[PDB]
Symmetry: D2
Subunit: 329 residues, 4 copies
């Protein structure tokens, strides 16, 4: 009789209930993976990418580390059969713009990649929520939505979750207040064209615009426009100094994963289908405050925007549809 | 009146749990992210010589830390940012080049530590030093000698990770979760490490009692293959991925947790071993140590066989053989 | 040679860095104690009360349970020397109003008890923050402030922290929103006279009063006044059904302890010195949004109140000073 | 249009995945409940007891407190339909021995109560794990097993989980070691007749009995028998000083709930069906080291016991069967 049989009497022998997949194990993917592991969101974690050596190596490195956590099942493969029955699938894979390549051609190359990834994801996890991180995130959330045929509640983009956190932080810096005691959103298109919603900014329900009506206008003696500028410059300076951004996006994605996996029903400014709002008729995605839970987006908060704020979202929607209508599925 | 003064009436205008990570390579930043997310530090300092990359990593962490219990994160090539650290983690060093001798490699690491350690000591004289840089047993000695710190405040990451791997694979053999297995890998980090079969148990039922031939050459179950797989485990990560980051990061974070939160948990870490197992020389090896707010408060005196004592004694001789030739 | 000396070689020997004291081990005190233990806020916990048997029994019951937590040092005694070097001291002890006793006489009996407790606390922990839970909490926070001679930043009352949470919850119930995604305060005097600040109530920075200006008035077709009424009736119905309230106050106190012990700089509507605000000239304490951290109250948020809201706080301040000025120290 | 419809656009209108029931809202029940809430083990918590006022009052007090936690769904009722689809059902209800009542009559009164409780539990949660806390726990685990007809893996008693923790602590005290770095079990019948397994006691795999073979015998110069005595006296001294034990059992039960609800596969000395082991032929339950996970007891660790240790378990088994065979189902 073996040592196993002398030491252990077994009574019985199952399926995971909180499985997350990360597609793409570049810097961003693995930052998402380590952040998710350490918030203990998943009882099974699956990693998928096309370079088989690097992929298995990352799986093993995580596994060994995970001996010092609440150790989950970690699997990996180029084959999407390892992603079966995921509650949440996080897409970080994509193509980066090359010198002399047009925006249209770049998005089309991303579309062609998603035409392989998304149907494979849907085949193996038909009930999953899709969280799109790949840039440009507003367009590629649309792309994932179109190819998956999923309802709008189960297709989310990382959107302005991180930029809103940055905005809240710098707002705090101006007021001598911790970022956690500040509220305010950056909405619309992820990046340069994003909209600082001044009306919504408050500390303890005391709205900033009420006390200082010139906040965010050209006539602003305190020049709060410089805050939103610094939010945008913030991301570029990380890339200039370090080469790329990993930790910041990783922890923003983990924040969204937490709200979904633990049904927290917290508000996040994430890329969602925006048709019907702000005089937008086209099938585009932009960031508005959404309530995230176990079925993805359960509700939108209907933010009242000024004339100028509506114009900026409308302009972004036009630009995005301008590209989306030229894409070939 | 400004918006600030209309909104906020201010009444009032040092960190108690400051950690420094020296070196922001893959291992350093894996230590940093793992420490941040276990919420161990109210201030985190990063130090390295490449100024751009360093500031970039600080900023990336800072922005991410908006989704955690946000601590103060600072960075610089200047060690003045490390002032009043409770714990300083050394990951910096030099890697062996093809045809470079062990002695020359350690000497290049010694020359680097002759800059790092005195700067650390200047700014955090009461800190615990945790050495991760390889080879870890020798470089823990190096840090000890240059710092002049007492043996309790100079620790090497040692066999903390390898012991976890060992416990896991032991579990795999027995059909048991790694957390319900006990057992250590002691001595020199790497190929020469010692699987202590006597100590291996599940729920206080010792494996060697039920199967006395466990770990010998005449072992019909061949438990020697378990320790072999622990060592091959680390190499296969390097072959497949290029380097190891996440595994060492989380092992270091485990040790940081025990120290920063005064958990008084047992870890097989590199500590001064002179006096034990008939070792006369000033060498460091991994034995079970109780880690808390003052570093190593106690050793557990593990009874070793003749063969186990011989392997530690041999490692100690090899290590002293190199240590005595180093120039400080 | 002993088993101890054969097994363990000792290298060194200490003092606690995160010590909390709970004064009073009635239902409220022990609810505070268990809630604080299990949020892992304290490396030393001290319990103080006058009934020696019950006190030691509660200490031992906690100690044995704490073997399944990050086990802290737990001490107890009638002698305040066990409270030495507390960062935070929580006062739950006091006297309860008897049939035919006047409010003034009750407060005076509480003053006489605090004239024993507070100087003993101050003797042994001169740098501690005082958190007052004992009712009536606004007056007894003043009493603790006067006897301690502590600066206003280190003397806090549990105030409207719980009632505000209840308010946010019921606001959420009306809107079909999770309590965590609702904002709004109940300010002023703890209990019946507390003020629902309608102006501050919002979801994702969209203020409720903007969309529905009649919110909280007598001509409110949705009758949001019933929400604040239910917050007040809520507490009485617990007392009628169960006999007393323990768990709710315990977890509210633990919330405040967390912000203080972990320097979170989170906003809580707690009883603080209100002289200078809302045309109040007297030394009274009422609940306004305060930022809590390792030095207690670091900042107040200056909430803009309507004429009627100012009147209600002013009236409470007058009533409280009316009693405070008749007290004998 | 209502304020709700102006503020929130809803996309979706579910079932709990981690539901726990606590039967009995006495001191022990509510200590289990608060401890389970604060380790965040349940997304739905159900409380059941026969006194309707007290029950609803405790539910409301918990609910209000839970606004400062990851707020779960909390329900209550005398009707077991509130317990539907529980993963784990914790039984604390039962009868206490009255003056001049025989042990047999007491157990029979507990059996008669379980003949109402257990079939109602099984009806509404047929796949649940049963955790029995009610004393005497080894007999009432058997009673629950017989009435439920559940397999032995899904019927567990709190057993020697707490007493083993106490033992480990006092072992640590002798060696100058933190309780977390000590290992050792107290096995068999809960209470006076429990067996300190000296062979299993170790620090870092260095077995105490190897260094000191006289450990636990009458000619032990260090008198380690006094340690097990103090474990037993420990529980009585809490009852003498305070009146009852709540916090200690609450946190022991929460420890077991954690291992089950989070599939930790940790070893606990819990009451399980012991027929086949240690020359025991009868259907009795005693504490042996069991691996607890999402399906309850997945494995036993087969502890080698001395002749004297086998005799003590055999004697307990005889005593327990002596009573069990006289019970009327
Ligand atoms: O309390 C403050 N800040 C605060 C509070 C808690 C922790 C920290 N730590 S930190 O300095 O390391 C820090 C922590 C997180 C941070 O996110 C930032 C984002 C930007 N930006 O331009 O996008 C700039 C700076 C940060 C940033 C800085 C800083 C104040 O801003 C002084 C009120
Ligand atoms: O239950 C088991 N394992 C288990 C328990 C809980 C989680 C996991 N997750 S995992 O498969 O992803 C995993 C998780 C962690 C792991 O660490 C490992 C180390 C080595 N090694 O050679 O050092 C090899 C494999 C692992 C390893 C694997 C694995 C058993 O081994 C079957 C008893
Ligand atoms: O999502 C909601 N509620 C919700 C969210 C998460 C958990 C729960 N759980 S619970 O129903 O058990 C619960 C949880 C906490 C609760 O606090 C309450 C306070 C009062 N009150 O009179 O002040 C009344 C009821 C509660 C209350 C109820 C309830 C909505 O209110 C429907 C939006
Ligand atoms: O470090 C130790 N103990 C320790 C470590 C960390 C925290 C504490 N806290 S405590 O003193 O408040 C405490 C904490 C937990 C405790 O469990 C106990 C059980 C018994 N018993 O008779 O069953 C008696 C006492 C305790 C007991 C005491 C105690 C040592 O016992 C000296 C090794």
């Amino acid at each position: 009789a073996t040592l196993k049989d002398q030491l252990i009497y077994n009574l019985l022998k199952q399926t995971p209930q909180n499985k997350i997949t990360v597609v793409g194990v570049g810097a961003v993917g693995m930052a998402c993976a380590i952040s998710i592991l350490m918030k203990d969101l998943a009882d099974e974690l699956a990693l998928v990418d096309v370079i088989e050596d690097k992929l298995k190596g990352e799986m093993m490195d995580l596994q060994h580390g995970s001996l010092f956590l609440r150790t989950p099942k970690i699997v990996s493969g180029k084959d999407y059969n390892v992603t079966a029955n995921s509650k949440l699938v996080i897409i970080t894979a994509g193509a980066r713009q090359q010198e002399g390549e047009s925006r249209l051609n770049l998005v089309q190359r991303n579309v062609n990649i998603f035409k392989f990834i998304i149907p494979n994801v849907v085949k193996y996890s038909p009930n999953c929520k899709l969280l799109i991180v790949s840039n440009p995130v507003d367009i590629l959330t649309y792309v994932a939505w179109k190819i998956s045929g999923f309802p709008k509640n189960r297709v989310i983009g990382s959107g302005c979750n991180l930029d809103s956190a940055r905005f809240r932080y710098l707002m705090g810096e101006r007021l001598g207040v911790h970022p956690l005691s500040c509220h305010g959103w950056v909405l619309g298109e992820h990046g340069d064209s994003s909209v600082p919603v001044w009306s919504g900014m408050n500390v303890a329900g005391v709205s900033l615009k009420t006390l200082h009506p010139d906040l965010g206008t050209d006539k602003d003696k305190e020049q709060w426009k410089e805050v939103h500028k610094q939010v945008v410059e913030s991301a570029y300076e990380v890339i200039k100094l370090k080469g790329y951004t990993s930790w910041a996006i990783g922890l923003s994605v983990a924040d969204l994963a937490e709200s979904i996996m633990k049904n927290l029903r917290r508000v996040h400014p994430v890329s969602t289908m925006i048709k019907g709002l702000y005089g937008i008729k086209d099938d585009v995605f932009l960031s508005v405050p959404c309530i995230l839970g176990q079925n993805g987006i359960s509700d939108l908060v209907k933010v009242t925007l000024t004339s100028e704020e509506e114009a900026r979202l409308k302009k972004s929607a036009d630009t995005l549809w301008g590209i989306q209508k030229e894409l070939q599925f």
